[PDB]
C-alpha cells in the first residue's frame, strides 16, 4: 500500500505474494533443516523443543 493500489494493481502485478513471517511449523522446520544439514549435531537435547519455543 506504499505503492498506489488503484494504479499499481493486478494485471501488472497479477501475482502479489505475501511471505509468511508469522510462519507455520513446517516453515520453521525447513529453516532449522538448512543448519541441520550443514553440520552434524551431537543429540544431547530435544530438537523439536527449540521449534515450538520460536
Amino acid at each position: 500500500d506504499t505503492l498506489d493500489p488503484a494504479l499499481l494493481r493486478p494485471g501488472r502485478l497479477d501475482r502479489k505474494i505475501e511471505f509468511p513471517s508469522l510462519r507455520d511449523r513446517r516453515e520453521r522446520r525447513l529453516i532449522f533443516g538448512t543448519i541441520a544439514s550443514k553440520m552434524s549435531l551431537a543429540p544431547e537435547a530435544d530438537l523439536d523443543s527449540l521449534i515450538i519455543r520460536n
Binding site: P5, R9, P10, G11, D14
Partner: protein, 101 residues
C-alpha cells in the same frame, strides 16, 4: 484548471457488464475459446472494475489449463479464475481502513 484553451472533455466509466462481455469475448477468441460458451455467463454474473481486470481473468484461466498440462480451457476454469482475480482486488484495497463508521 482555469479557462485557457482546454474545452473538450471525454468521460470514461469503468466497464459495465455489457462492455465487459465484449472485452472478454475477443481475448478468449484469440487465445483458447471458453467451452460451453459461458464467457457470457461470467460477464452477466459479475462486474469487474476495469478492462485491466478482464485481461487478468484471461491470463489465469489459461494458466489453469497449463497446470494440468492441457492447452484448452473450459467453463470450470473461468469460474475458478474470476473468483481469484476479483476477490484479490478487494482484499488489497480494503486494508487501509481501520474501523471508522
Amino acid at each position: 484548471l482555469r479557462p485557457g484553451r482546454i474545452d473538450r472533455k471525454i468521460e470514461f466509466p469503468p466497464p459495465s457488464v455489457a462492455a465487459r462481455a465484449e472485452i472478454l469475448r475477443i481475448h478468449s477468441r484469440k487465445m483458447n475459446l471458453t467451452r460451453g460458451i459461458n464467457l457470457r455467463k461470467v460477464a452477466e454474473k459479475m462486474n469487474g472494475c476495469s478492462g485491466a481486470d478482464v485481461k487478468g481473468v484471461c491470463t489465469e484461466a489459461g494458466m489453469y489449463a497449463l497446470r494440468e498440462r492441457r492447452i484448452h480451457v473450459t467453463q470450470e476454469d473461468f469460474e475458478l479464475a474470476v473468483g481469484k482475480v476479483m476477490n484479490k482486488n478487494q482484499e488489497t484495497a480494503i486494508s487501509v481502513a481501520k474501523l471508522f463508521k
